[model samples]
Target: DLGKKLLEAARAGQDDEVRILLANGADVNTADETGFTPLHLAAWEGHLGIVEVLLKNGADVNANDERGHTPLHLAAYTGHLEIVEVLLKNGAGVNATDVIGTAPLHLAAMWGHLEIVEVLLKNGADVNIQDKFGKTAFDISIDNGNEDLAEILQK
Candidate 1:
């Protein structure tokens, strides 16, 4: 099983090595004990090229980790705007929510990444989607005192 190697290579950001492993029949969709896929690792680390390879090798764009956080969700949370964009272009769910129903938009808003929030919104992310506690991205923005983002979400 390439599970450990696949994840380790991805976690180490070894792009070429990862490709080799995948070529050797590594399951790109293999998850760890936490259900974190190589795609999730690549995205969370802001490894755009590695993320590309994994996605091309048939990694599930919408795959979730243990916490039900997708690659897009992690990408947005980490403030990797380009990574988020790439995931979206690769058919990642714009409104994919986590265990708590928090989408990438919510993560972007919670972290105060205005550009990400804007892009997610433009990608058709529902600004009104609420999480477990009934907190929308707008509400998060307001709570975080990000009036600019709140205003943008309102509009």
Candidate 2:
């Protein structure tokens, strides 16, 4: 199967097609070959408009892909603070973990995205959630030489 058209539309950032598909009752949670939903694509691409539209059309804010990464995870990992805020406001789980057990905070810290780490922390993300590697956000920040984030997390 080629997956749903809405998923493609979101990936391609085709806002018009996305609106039309939603109007036609396309499932917003439909996953593509990689198990990523339209919301995931929009978030990963930092398409704030598409993300808002999808959320308005009832996309799952916390929908996890095959890798157990939610739209919030993608947004956080990419340092998309605006998208992360949108996802959180739309009910995305702040503490949701991916396959490696790394929560949004952990990913943000690991990537040295200090802004994202701040946002996730403000939204109630657990700074202490240990990944499968048994490393917390603080640990990852230290390990990755993100001393700024590590110092901020310590406070």
Candidate 3:
């Protein structure tokens, strides 16, 4: 019930209610049945304002869901550049790998999100970092049929 409330507030973009919940001692890092934090829902929905509010209230920028994916990972994979920027500026670990060792950059590249890839790279993301499949971000891009992204990664 608490998790549902948290996710609903985030999904609805109720910044004030979210603030109130956090202020009233609702766990900022609380997860749903799938281990998705409010921040994850906010980011996944591209709710930039809600994401900011949650981060300001101390939501974990790098909190992973049941799939071992951080909010940044979700944002980047979805090509939400603004959300990615917010997460990165808030100290989300760009190099943080998921269960498959795929970092945010890998997801961004695989999804052909060149802008997000550029941002992550500029922020010092490891371009050469290999995933569990022993592939780099560039490799993933190619595998995902993101030729342009792979070309950009080459630079």
Top-TM-score structure, candidate number? 1
The parts of candidate 3 lying over 4 Å away from their true place are none
The residue ranges of model 2 lying beyond 4 angstroms of the native Cα positions read: 1-3
lDDT of 2 by residue, 14-67 (tens): 999999888887888898877899999999988899999999987889998999
Better of 1 and 3 by lDDT: 1
RMSD of each: 1.1, 1.7, 1.6
Q: Kindly give the number of clashing pairs for every candidate.
A: 0, 0, 0
Writing each residue's lDDT as its tens digit, candidate 1 over 14-94 gives: 998899999999999999999999999989888999999998889999998889999999999999988999999999899
C-alpha TM-score for every candidate: 0.96, 0.94, 0.92
> What is the model-wide C-alpha lDDT for candidate 1?
0.90
Using lDDT, give the best candidate's number: 1
Per-candidate Cα lDDT values, in order, are 0.90, 0.87, 0.86
lDDT, candidate 3, residue 106? Answer: 90
Total backbone clashes of candidate 3, pairs 3 or more residues apart or in separate chains: 0
Worst 10 residues of 1 by lDDT: 146-155
